[PDB]
Amino acid sequence: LVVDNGSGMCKAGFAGDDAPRAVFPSGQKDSYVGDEAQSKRGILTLKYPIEHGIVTNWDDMEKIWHHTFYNELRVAPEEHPVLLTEAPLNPKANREKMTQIMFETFNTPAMYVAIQAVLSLYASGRTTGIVMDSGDGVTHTVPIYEGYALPHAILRLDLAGRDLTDYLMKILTERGYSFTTTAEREIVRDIKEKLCYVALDFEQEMATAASSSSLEKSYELPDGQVITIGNERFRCPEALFQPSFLGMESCGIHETTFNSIMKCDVDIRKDLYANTVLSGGTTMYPGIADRMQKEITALAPSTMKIKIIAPPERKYSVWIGGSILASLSTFQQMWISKQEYDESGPSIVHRKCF
Template sequence: MADLHNTPIVIDNGSGTIRAGYAGEDLPKCFFPSFVGRPKHLRVLAGGLEGDVFIGNRAQELRGLLKIKYPLEHGIVTDWDDMERIWQYIYTDELKTLSEEHPVLLTEAPLNPRQNRDTAAQILFETFNVPALYTSIQAVLSLYASGRTTGIVLDAGDGVSHAVPVYEGFAIPSSIRRIDVAGRDVTEHLQTLLRKQGSVFHTSAEKEIVKNIKEKTSYIALDPKKEEKEWMSSAAGRGGESKAVEYPLPDGQKLRIGPERFRAPESVFDPEIVGSEWPGLHQIVVD
């Protein structure tokens, strides 16, 4: 029972990134992409990659040599073995503590299947032997962190976007709106736009490059139609494409990013662009 009085560990289980640390601290102890990497090729020489599975910053460094897989898709775990490996990595390599000694606060997206939560609880209790577990919606915790207990939270992550009304610390389930269109869909749309431009990013590691391009160069246009006209006129005129930027690729080449910078993020406001029938991000807030 003494373990229940130890500082709880908070694990923010995101589709794209995972954060973990101790409750009460200002910043998480660790923050890394929530993917698992496995070598593309067999190790045949001494000095090759040691290990079969790579997680965290090491996986990020070696991503060009790895097949990358995300165990979470749209906020739902699709590979529990890899999810367990990531949790084990958090305890062993990042927090350097025993899972049996700390209660756990685990976050999840709203309107997730009950089976997802049950399996997570089963693994944490039976495999990691945690003394206590509490699951909470990410949006509610975000509001707490801002010092408020009432408000509407719009949380657009890598796999899921949702609008959650919270009153006096409690989410109102009947009014929660969720769409499975988020950052990863923007990345895939940007990947398609760049392919049309002649730049092909095919492998899972190259997709991470596209994600970085998105994060460093993309922006949201307040008036997409007006923005489109400005790009068209600047491209036709002398010295056009004033808003175009160059992104340095790992091999030293520079990729010129044009109107793709604002076209890619438009997919979260108009998901039909990427073939989804979900409402836009702005619409779920209004609803």
């Protein structure tokens, strides 16, 4: 079972597969008998119970899980160890609650799950390096050393690409034709996914887009118009970096990353200095990498060096990490199985020791 409840999707294949066989959209056999038609359409009706990186409902998840691999994946999990994903951060309460339902309705032999950041780091082929988890709705910092995520080192910041688009449309009223409707929100996001790059900085980009006006790109779109002088494009990333644009004046994300690295011992930061890979969710355009590189280089001592890593595609990265860990051939040493579930319940999960 390489099922992985992603940000909004669940993808079911096997560890050895190159990809999951089925998707989770939240009439193949539906004209022969119709037995699974009702079950799958009912499961389809149920919604995604995960928001902002924390579980919010529990009955529906098991409701969906039952069907999703009892009617198309055709697998008995009693004869299988289990490997799912989870929301980026939760206290032990959700973990030990999910263990109860999993065992009491499936009684599967063993289990192990990990934070999505670890899966992404494995997919990129790293066991080290902090990744900027710029997820939807909210972003987080997860410095990974050797694979395990530090419970004392996770920082959470409320920035979102939705917020960037909203702030753009908060300064698109100053552009004349504002944009607020569903179609207008969609076209703002479309233009953002077309061009909101970073060259170096706000004022110097605006000068070269207004004094010489050589950064203009005419929008010949059925849903768009030539209303950008090169300002609004670059006006999306700026609030991504400088908080006071949005009106919530606080420290920069770079500050949060720098502190989350400095609080640890300097030596291990070297390894964190090594890769320092990134992740999407709110960032898709270049100019991010070198800009944040130099921006944190201002915060980084000249005696030490820093690296920036960003793969172009990270869509099944958690799935790749899961598939790799399923074949790591040492993760079974950390399986939590019936031998401990029926012995101690959820207490060992709580780490009664230390």
